[PDB]
Amino acid sequence: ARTFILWLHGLGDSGPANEPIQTQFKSSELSNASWLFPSAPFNPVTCNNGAVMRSWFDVPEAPFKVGSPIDESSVLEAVKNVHAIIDQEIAEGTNPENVFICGLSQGGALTLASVLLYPKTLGGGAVLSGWVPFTSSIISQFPEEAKKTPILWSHGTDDRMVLFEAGQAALPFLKEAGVTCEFKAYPGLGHSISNKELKYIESWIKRRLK
C-alpha cells in the first residue's frame, strides 16, 4: 500500500540537500513510497555561539557525550512540527503503520523524540547517529501505542561528533521506556552516512512492511 517516509536532516543542512538519499533506496518494494524532506527553521544554535542556521532544536554542547546538556523544551517544539506532518498524512488516508521516520544526527534525535511521543503506532523510526534529546522525566508521557513502534538505531563506532557511547546510552533509556530497539553498530564509521548503512535501513523497512 501507500508508504510514507519522512527524512529529517542534520544540523545546518536542508531538506532538498538530502532528497538524493532516496536514490540509494533502489528496491522495487520501496519504489512507490512517498518521501518528504522538510527543512528546519533558521534558529540560533548555542554550541555555535548563537549563530543562526537550519536547526530542528537548540544544541547546547557538541561533541555530544553521555551527560552532555540538552534543551528539552526546544525539542518538544520541533516534535510538534513533525507531528503536524504525520497528522496531515494520516488525515489523508495513510495507515500509520505505513509511516516511517528517519533522521541523521540532529534529525535522528528528532526522529526518536517524534516517534516516542506520537499517539499512534507508526511503521518505524530509523535513527542515524542520533542521541537521546531529553531526560527520563519525559518517559511517563510516551503514549501507549508509541511504545510499539520499532526503532532501528545505526551508529558509527568511530563517531567523535556524537559519541558512540551516547548512542549506546539510548538502549537502557529505551528499555526503561518499554521500547523495542535494534542497535546496529558500524565499525570505523564516523559522523556520516555509509551506503551499507542505508541498505540495511531499506532492508529493515521492507521487513517491517512484511
Residue numbers in the entry: 2 to 211
Show sentences the authors wrote.
To elucidate the molecular features encoded by these conserved elements, we solved the crystal structures of Arabidopsis thaliana SOBER1 and Zea mays B6T1C9, each representing a different clade in the phylogenetic tree. Both proteins fold into a canonical α/β hydrolase architecture and superpose with a root-mean-square deviation (RMSD) of atomic positions of 1.54 Å over 210 amino acid residues. We found that a loop constituting the hydrophobic tunnel lid is the major component determining substrate turnover rate and substrate specificity.
To test for the importance of L63 for deacetylation, we constructed a L63A mutant of AtSOBER1 and analyzed its structural and biochemical properties. While wild type AtSOBER1 features a shallow binding groove for the acetate, with a protein surface provided by the side chain of L63, the crystal structure of the L63A mutant showed a massively changed surface, with the hydrophobic tunnel now opened up right behind the active site. In addition, longer substrates were able to enter the tunnel, as demonstrated by higher affinities to pNP butyrate (C4), valerate (C5) and hexanoate (C6). Furthermore, we tested the L63A mutant in tobacco leaves and found the protein to be compromised in AvrBsT-elicited HR repression. The structural information we obtained allowed us to create a mutant (AtSOBER1 L63A), with impaired ability to deacetylate, but is still a functional enzyme with increased activity on longer substrates. In agreement, this mutant protein is compromised in suppression of HR in planta. Taken together with the structural and biochemical data we obtained, this highly suggests deacetylation as the underlying reaction for HR suppression by SOBER1.
